[PDB]
């Protein structure tokens, strides 16, 4: 009855479940104490690793850069280093990525 | 005569006390308890939602499990005499 948009509300399954965390302020600060406790158990070394700069794929995001997963073995070699030894110095290495651009190879 | 007069014939007893669970439900001609399922090695699946909370962990005495819980708060040190061997 009446002129309305046709409704599509899906509540026909009795098996459905609802989920709510009712106190997200105490949940955030309990996770920041966990994060500061790992940091001084690794004390001298900084708990995060150095990551490369990469480029977003399609034509919609073409003109945007970003932090990626890891460096390649050729980028590590030309910076005077072996990738087994870059991993002991807090540098992340990704052996899946391939090398196809010379400007981006130089920034990294 | 299926009413009052038929009740005067009911003097035979089919069950006895079960040696696993203690109810009057061990059927002697069947050789089987209708409550707990003895002599099957496992206990019978309860017949109702309330039946689960009438006989479970905690409805009896827990003679050993209470002791073990006090020992696991202190690292399970045992008798102080025998501690030299260990």
């Amino acid at each position: 009855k009446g002129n309305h948009a046709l409704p599509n509300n899906h509540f026909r399954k009795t098996s459905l479940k609802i989920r709510i965390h009712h106190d997200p302020e105490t949940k955030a600060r309990v996770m920041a104490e966990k994060k500061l406790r790992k940091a001084k158990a690794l004390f001298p070394m900084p708990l995060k690793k150095l990551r490369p700069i990469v480029r977003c794929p399609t034509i919609k995001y073409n003109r945007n850069e970003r932090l990626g997963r890891g460096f390649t073995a050729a980028e590590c070699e030309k910076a005077g280093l072996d990738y087994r030894h870059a991993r002991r110095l807090g540098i992340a290495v990704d052996l899946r990525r391939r090398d196809t651009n010379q400007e981006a190879f130089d920034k990294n | 005569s299926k009413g009052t007069a038929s009740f005067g014939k009911k003097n035979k007893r089919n069950t006895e006390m079960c040696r696993r669970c203690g109810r009057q439900s061990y059927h002697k001609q069947k050789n089987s308890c209708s409550s707990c399922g003895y002599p099957n090695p496992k206990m019978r699946n309860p017949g109702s939602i309330k039946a689960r909370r009438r006989r479970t962990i905690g409805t009896g005495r827990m003679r050993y499990m209470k002791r073990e819980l006090r020992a696991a708060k202190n690292g399970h040190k045992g008798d102080p005499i025998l501690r030299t061997l260990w």
Partner: protein, 50 residues
């Protein structure tokens, strides 16, 4: 009846020496006055079931 098993006899004995009122020296105390056992059974009204 006169015939009965050994396990039937020892449970009838336990039920028998339970059906008793609070002793008199405990009722005469200052902080136990007005107390009666209230878990009493009479053989005509309620049955034990073997």
């Amino acid at each position: 009846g006169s015939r009965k098993t050994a396990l039937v006899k020892t449970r009838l004995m336990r039920a028998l020496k339970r059906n008793r009122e609070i002793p008199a020296w405990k009722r005469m105390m200052k902080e136990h006055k007005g107390e009666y056992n209230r878990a009493r059974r009479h053989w005509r009204s309620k049955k034990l079931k073997i």
